[PDB]
Amino acid sequence: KSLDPGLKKGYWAPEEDAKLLQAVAKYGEQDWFKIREEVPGRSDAQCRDRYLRRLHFSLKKGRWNLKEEEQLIELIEKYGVGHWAKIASELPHRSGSQ
DNA sequence: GAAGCGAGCACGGTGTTTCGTCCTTTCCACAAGATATATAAAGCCAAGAAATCGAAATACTTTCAAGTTACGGTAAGCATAT
């Protein structure tokens, strides 16, 4: 993921919306090593988290309404603090990064 | 005619070869060696087949090199809010 002349450190999505989203239907959620051979400028390490955080569906998003605080409470009430504790390993997709 | 000058032939030598034993064999022969055979107990020598153990080959364990999935935490420049 570094010192590579073929990688691109860009920020926007030039051609990515196709080059990376084709893997959605082309290949499953495993063996990312196969896709990196066709998409230039993109590495597997960043590709995994990009694919994950861009196409996910079930996430607590929207405006902070009068009913979201109970959601947060029952979230931190599942197993513990969650954000960094080891319980983060079983919280489904609620990693500390977010 | 017999005394002074040139005269055969028996004889006496080595050296070389021949002849004829004595040599040790090859070969042969009369008398007597195991040579067959009967034990039989003993322990050891010694040339064949069957069971056993050492070496190791190909095989599978196991352990040690590579490495890429999956995973958890911080930092910058564009967008957007009062």
Curated annotation (Swiss-Prot):
Residue stretches making up the HTH myb-type domain: 4-59, 60-98
DNA-binding region: 32-55, 84-98
Location(s) in or outside the cell: Nucleus
Origin superkingdom: Eukaryota
Role summary: Part of the SNAPc complex required for the transcription of both RNA polymerase II and III small-nuclear RNA genes. Binds to the proximal sequence element (PSE), a non-TATA-box basal promoter element common to these 2 types of genes. Recruits TBP and BRF2 to the U6 snRNA TATA box.
Disease listed for this protein: Neurodevelopmental disorder with motor regression, progressive spastic paraplegia, and oromotor dysfunction: An autosomal recessive disorder characterized by delayed motor development and developmental regression after the first year of life, followed by progressive spasticity with gait alterations, paraparesis, and oromotor dysfunction. Most individuals have cerebral, cerebellar, or basal ganglia volume loss.
Subunit field text: Part of the SNAPc complex composed of 5 subunits: SNAPC1, SNAPC2, SNAPC3, SNAPC4 and SNAPC5. SNAPC4 interacts with SNAPC1, SNAPC2, SNAPC5, BRF2 and TBP.
Protein name from the UniProt record: snRNA-activating protein complex subunit 4
Species name: Homo sapiens
Full protein: residues contained: 393 to 490 of 1469
